[PDB]
């Protein structure tokens, strides 16, 4: 599994969350999103294989996943309280972070 697989894992589990009926299902999918975000954060995106590991672009990339993981944790907290609809709405906003921070490097 590489960075592209991790990106598609995020997409598949966002669909799981969208279609979920209860908080347990949302928690499972958020778990897989968090795992894939951690794996992707350690990868070097194609457009940045050029750059040095501490370039402003690579810091952008890794920090986009720090923000994403923190937002996944916020959604997990909602799901852990039984707030299914709140957690699903939070998951929708994970696409805003994913698209704005990370997409420009794939």
Author numbering: 1 to 106
What does the paper say about this structure?
Previous studies showed that proper introduction of disulfide bonds could stabilize the flexible region of target proteins and reduce the conformational entropy by locking the protein into single desired conformation. We applied our method on two proteins which were previously determined to high resolution and frequently used as fusion partners for GPCR crystallization, cytochrome b562 (BRIL) and Flavodoxin, and verified our prediction by solving the crystal structures of the wild type (WT) proteins and mutants.
Eventually, four pairs of BRIL mutants and three pairs of Flavodoxin mutants, together with their WT proteins, were crystallized and structure determined. For BRIL proteins, the simulation B-factors are consistent with the experimental values. Based on our algorithm, the best-engineered constructs of BRIL and Flavodoxin show lower entropy and higher diffraction quality than the wild type proteins, and the predicted disulfide bond on GLP-1R facilitated crystallization of the GLP-1R transmembrane domain.
